[model samples]
Target: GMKSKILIFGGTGYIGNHMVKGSLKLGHPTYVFTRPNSSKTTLLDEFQSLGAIIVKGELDEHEKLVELMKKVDVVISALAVPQYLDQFKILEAIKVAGNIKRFLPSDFGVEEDRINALPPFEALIERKRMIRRAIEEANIPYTYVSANCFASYFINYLLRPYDPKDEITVYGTGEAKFAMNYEQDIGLYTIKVATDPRALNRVVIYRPSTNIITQLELISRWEKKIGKKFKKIHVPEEEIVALTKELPEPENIPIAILHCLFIDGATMSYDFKENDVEASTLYPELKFTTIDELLDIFVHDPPPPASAAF
Candidate 1:
């Protein structure tokens, strides 16, 4: 099969930037869809310099999106939260265009179907699940990627090595382990799966053994790296549950997501049936960064917690 021509939404975002780079690196004709007045022009300009064809338009522009969809073999949406429903417009366009081989949604988080989470987190999953059900109903060939926790985002949150804080917040026992994918690997694997025949219509989870680690392991490594021990602030499961209800709206979300992600141990514990795909096994040729290597990167060069943008 020939390489896919990908038109990616949210190309200027946290995970989206890497997907754009991955498509180009793998020799795909990548079309990045950006808003007319996006705040991140420099990054878009940089992608253009490296051969991404930037298409400026709104997500609701039905005719424009259909026209763009006709030009590409695949559509990968890395759209952030608050704009997840926006993909409904893209889904409708794909149904009309009727040419895209695969449609990958912007779910580079946990596997939502199996995970039992906090109310706010469960609400988030419901939104993404609605998109999934809609695509299935439309008979669109799709790949749902559970890239797990982004290594960059979670690493920074786990260990404030760069912005050295007085203590680290450890949810629950801090014994539960979870997988974290490097942003580059998430991008590369996402592109790989979008074009893979086996990954067609499968829930591809990125859970490499190296990336599977616990908060205790994370703190131990950072302690070894900095040669200094800090206080570990452990938040009990009951307290996290209470906080989710006590705090209001979005303010409750940060802790709420942590409860689902860390306290519940959703990423690691979920059982994969024969049908769903584990990414690293599918692409053994591709190498992924481990938690230790990522910690080193954080110590020397840290990435900002940019996910707060959405």
Candidate 2:
């Protein structure tokens, strides 16, 4: 039986909430650290009443975080950012926190080392590279989940009907194939990774499944599921950036860069070929969800906007 006490920082957010649920389900005595003003209503309600500890702490307050870290065997940092503010603060605090056996830093997207050959995304990955370097320097045990494109986010953003009003937007050729994962699957894997003794001090490249489908395939599936023919508007790289710039604040810069990369084939780069269900046979329960099944969920039972999958 699994019974390690685990600490999850950024616990009220989309990914964080899933991690909390997964950890508790695995029978770990789990606690979530959030800022005092942070909202926990959507998903946190289920855990709060069920005995998960909800603590308040500032990311930069090293002493407070260290104090919380003392009680747990491992710390999973599902920290996100406009860039890497939370990543930096969490790394700093964990260093002060004593004897943390494992610290999983948030490298939940591309593998920075593998993608270093690329230009701008490579530059973007430097912050992640620095966080990994800092973990090594501090001699903390660590693991990274290099989940490719989160499947649900891609469907919502890249595929259309994102809103009732907008036309489907496909970039470059929409024919570029990319790896995808359901957010629920990623959450399950995070719990599996955090608790498994074998997963320590290494980088784990987890893909729910390596289904390399293009935007064209995605739109076709959406049309079939939603039972509606939608108009498609293809945007070139220059126009995507120009349009992205016109949008207001925080959302524009990162998502625009992301679109530019996707168009350029960033999401299409990696392959988790060996683990294609056959590899997951080691863990019989670790079944990867199919893209078609995900489409069914999206079209029929749409999750909330703030939900991580969306």
Per-model clash counts, in order, read: 0, 0
Question: Model 2's lDDT to the true fold?
Answer: 0.68
Q: Considering every candidate listed, which one attains the maximal TM-score?
A: 1
Worst lDDT run of 10 residues, candidate 2, spans 273-282
Write one digit per residue (lDDT tens) for candidate 1, span 143-232: 999999988888877876567677888999999888898999899889998999999999999998888888988888889987989899
How do the residues 1-310 of candidate 2 rate in per-residue lDDT, one tens digit apiece? 3477888876776677778887877778888887777666645667787668888767777788777778888788776654365676766666777667778887677666655432334455777788888888878788876766677776776663448744777786676666677777777778787766656766666544445577778888778887777788877767766656576554454545456346655655755443222223336766767788888888777654432320
Q: Which candidate leads the pack in lDDT?
A: 1
What TM-score would you give candidate 2 relative to the actual structure?
Answer: 0.84
Cα-based lDDT at residue 213, candidate 1: 83
TM-score, each model?
A: 0.96, 0.84
Please report, as a residue range, the 10-residue window in candidate 1 with the lowest summed lDDT: 301-310
